[PDB]
């Protein structure tokens, strides 16, 4: 897997170039925002069960056909598989957020996930809805705008990290 | 794998319905014919070697090219594999007869059997002929009409179980 | 689906052997016990709505705290979902009685149930209370025969043990 630094190095390696000043300054910005990034990852992981359960429950509430017989969330086995998949997707999204790069997510969760879901009959629209609710809740936790759970952090702007989390979730949605 | 009772349950679960009176009556009929079904399974398994060997021999005698060089029954290795695969088909047919449902047959024998035989070069028509001779011999043993074996059973009609065995063999033949 | 027939056939297939005397003997046991099994299943299918109502009422009576905000029964929607869950379990018990084994329950209501209930803040004690009430409410010979009662109470006890 790769991180932001590993991504910069891989990009530089393509041109046989030592890491340029612009890339070095970008990674210095990454480090200077590293405390904010750790804040964001802590906010996601400290509410991971909250995020996943809320997203799956909302996906079910908007689409009660998922829990109807023949639906993909009927059969507590399938329900637990759905909650597990939401937790796995959020875990790899948190990995990507911590790393600053989506390589871990794309290579270990999204790699072959679409065809796996198609073979299993997992509805891509419902999965995308669950991932989008996870995105909204995770972004709210990054920005500390969750109505029912506020995590104390020093005042600042983490819109870059919220946008990064949204980008990882959009990558998850586009992969399927 | 599913039996007749589990097949009824699965059909009822697709409707989120408790097992209806009609399905319960069908399963009660299955139970009332259970001794006949056990006798049918005993008839098949007590002559399984005879059934398989006779069917393979008839398939070869009708298609002597099978034991010719390049034929798929030439090479005692290939003959043993043919007898083994015929015995496996009869074993899964007997499983289906005992269970009253073809789920075990398809899932554990017929899933990918056509593709496997195509890859191996196993002739589909000769395999179908062997399966059909197994069908006729097994049907005769169910109805105790086998000219060279009379299983002592109480007098009655086992044509339903004979038709079930024929349907399982037809499912095997259509799978390949 | 875990049943007598499927268990014996799976064992024979794992050993790669034709059905033998023991397999037919087990199916004979299926035949003999099917009377009580299907009696219990038919009674449950015919009276499940009242049974489910009683089980849900007992569950919420023993645990009124479920109606508190932030708990599982904090709204009519999820109170109805509790009753629907009890109906799902009773339908799976009916399926188990029809099948002759815990197969339907194992695969559709028990597998992953622990993870779902932990993730959704559903205390297993509430399900256990509903099923215990259903088990102890059963009356012989008023509701069913003694052996049908044995099958029904065995399915309920299996669910309870899966939850506790």
């Amino acid at each position, epitope marked *: 897997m790769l991180d932001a630094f590993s991504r910069v190095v891989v990009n530089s390696d393509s041109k046989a170039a030592y890491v340029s000043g612009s890339d070095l300054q970008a990674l210095k910005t990454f480090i200077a925002d590293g405390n904010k990034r750790l804040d964001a990852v802590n906010s996601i992981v400290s509410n991971a069960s909250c995020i996943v359960s809320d997203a799956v429950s909302g996906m079910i*509430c*908007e*689409n*009660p*056909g998922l*829990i*109807a*017989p023949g*639906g993909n969330c009927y059969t507590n086995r399938r329900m637990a598989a759905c909650l597990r998949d939401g937790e796995i997707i959020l875990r790899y999204t948190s990995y990507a957020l911590l790393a600053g790069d989506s390589s871990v997510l794309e290579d270990r969760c999204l790699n072959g996930l679409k065809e796996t879901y198609i073979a299993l009959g997992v509805p891509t*629209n419902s999965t995308a*809805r669950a991932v989008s609710i996870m995105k909204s809740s995770a972004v709210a936790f990054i920005s500390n705008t969750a109505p029912q759970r506020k995590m104390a952090t020093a005042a600042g702007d983490c819109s870059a990290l919220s946008s990064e989390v949204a980008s990882y979730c959009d990558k998850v949605s586009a992969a399927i | 794998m599913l039996d007749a009772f589990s097949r009824v349950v699965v059909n009822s679960d697709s*409707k*989120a*319905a408790y097992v209806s009176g009609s399905d319960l009556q069908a399963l009660k009929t299955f139970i009332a014919d259970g001794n006949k079904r056990l006798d049918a399974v005993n008839s098949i398994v007590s002559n399984a070697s005879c059934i398989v060997s006779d069917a393979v021999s008839g398939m070869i005698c009708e298609n002597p090219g099978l034991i010719a060089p390049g034929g798929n029954c030439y090479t005692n290795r290939r003959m043993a594999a043919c007898l083994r695969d015929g015995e496996i088909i009869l074993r899964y047919t007997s499983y289906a007869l005992l269970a009253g449902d073809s789920s075990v047959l398809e899932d554990r024998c017929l899933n990918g059997l056509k593709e496997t035989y195509i890859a191996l070069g196993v002739p589909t028509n000769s395999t179908a002929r062997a399966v059909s001779i197994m069908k006729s011999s097994a049907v005769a043993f169910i109805s105790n009409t086998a000219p060279q074996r009379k299983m002592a059973t109480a007098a009655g009609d086992c044509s339903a179980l004979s038709s079930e065995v024929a349907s399982y063999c037809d499912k095997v033949s259509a799978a390949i | 689906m875990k049943s007598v027939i499927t268990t014996t056939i799976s064992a024979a297939d794992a050993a790669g052997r034709f059905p033998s005397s023991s397999d037919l003997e087990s199916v004979q046991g299926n035949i003999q016990r099917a009377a009580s099994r299907l009696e219990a299943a038919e009674k449950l299918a015919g009276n499940h*709505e009242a049974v*489910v*109502k009683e089980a849900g009422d007992a569950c919420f009576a023993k645990y009124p705290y479920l109606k508190n905000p932030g708990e599982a029964g904090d*709204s*009519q*929607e999820k*109170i*109805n*979902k509790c*009753y*629907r869950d009890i*109906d799902h379990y009773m339908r799976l018990i009916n399926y188990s009685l029809v099948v002759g084994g815990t197969g339907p329950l194992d695969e559709w209501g028990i597998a992953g149930a622990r993870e779902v209930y932990r993730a959704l803040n559903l205390p297993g004690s509430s399900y256990i209370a509903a099923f215990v009430f259903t088990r102890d409410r059963l009356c012989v010979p008023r509701d069913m025969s003694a052996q049908a009662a044995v099958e029904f109470s065995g399915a309920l006890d299996y669910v309870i043990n899966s939850l506790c």
Partner: T-cell receptor, first 124, second 107 residues
Framework: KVTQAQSSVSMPVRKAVTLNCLYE???????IFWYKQLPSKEMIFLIR?????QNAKSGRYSVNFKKAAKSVALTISALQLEDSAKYFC????????????????????????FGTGIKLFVEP | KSVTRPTRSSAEITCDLT??????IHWYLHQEGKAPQRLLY??????????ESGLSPGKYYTHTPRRWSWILILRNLIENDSGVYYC?????????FGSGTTLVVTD
């Protein structure tokens, strides 16, 4: 089925009027909705009252629900001048999964049964 | 808000439901003297029309002009078909309703 027996009720401004709607049902759990149809015919949701909930309240709007009598008559209080419309007692079971017919429908296909409505005139 | 169409013609009932995650769209007719009643609901995912019992197929069709957009089609209009039509989808607390269009069928 919904039965709003009385229509065209009249009540002055800054007053309270109770719109008596009944219903027939075979549903164990259900909800009762109260809609006012504006002169623009914009059906507007006012209050939601379920079969297994305490009598609903939405500030000005309130419900006096009954289970055995099936009287879920909405009560409006402190009427404003712009409160006159055609008020509909709507019986549906949207967020209900148990206690209805054995159809394979996921309650998103379920129809909202309406009463013939009661027009309210807010006299000054 | 109004649609006037001759008898034995076709009426297009658009509405303003901006619901994105809709799965079913119900079409209610208020004939201004009776209760608002459903003719059918549109299965949005599978694109099916479910006419209520006793009706005849080919009377009501739900058209999808865009993504999240619906229109009720009325073949061989008659005067009884006149009324007010709503597209209704269930929301979390209630059933959301469009602004409602009035279909008057003139000779």
């Amino acid at each position: 089925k919904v039965t709003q027996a009385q229509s065209s009720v009249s009540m002055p401004v800054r007053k309270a009027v109770t719109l008596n709607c009944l219903y027939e049902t075979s549903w164990w759990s259900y909800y009762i909705f109260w809609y006012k149809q504006l002169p623009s015919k914009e059906m507007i949701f006012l209050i939601r009252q379920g079969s297994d909930e305490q009598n609903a309240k939405s500030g000005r709007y309130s419900v006096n629900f009954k289970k055995a009598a099936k009287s879920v008559a909405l009560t409006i209080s402190a009427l404003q001048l712009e409160d006159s419309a055609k008020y509909f007692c709507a019986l549906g079971a949207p967020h209900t999964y148990w206690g209805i017919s054995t159809d394979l429908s996921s309650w998103d296909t379920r129809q909202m049964f309406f009463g013939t409505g009661i027009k309210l005139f807010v006299e000054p | 808000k109004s649609v006037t169409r001759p008898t034995r013609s076709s009426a297009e009932i658009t509405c303003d439901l901006t619901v994105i995650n809709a799965f079913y769209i119900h079409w209610y007719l208020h004939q201004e003297g009776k209760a608002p009643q459903r003719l059918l609901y549109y299965d949005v995912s599978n694109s099916k029309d479910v006419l209520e019992s006793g009706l005849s197929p080919g009377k009501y069709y739900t058209h999808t002009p865009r993504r999240w957009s619906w229109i009720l089609i009325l073949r061989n209009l008659i005067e009884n078909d006149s009324g007010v039509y709503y597209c209704a989808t269930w929301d979390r607390p209630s059933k959301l309703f469009g602004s409602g269009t009035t279909l008057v069928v003139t000779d």
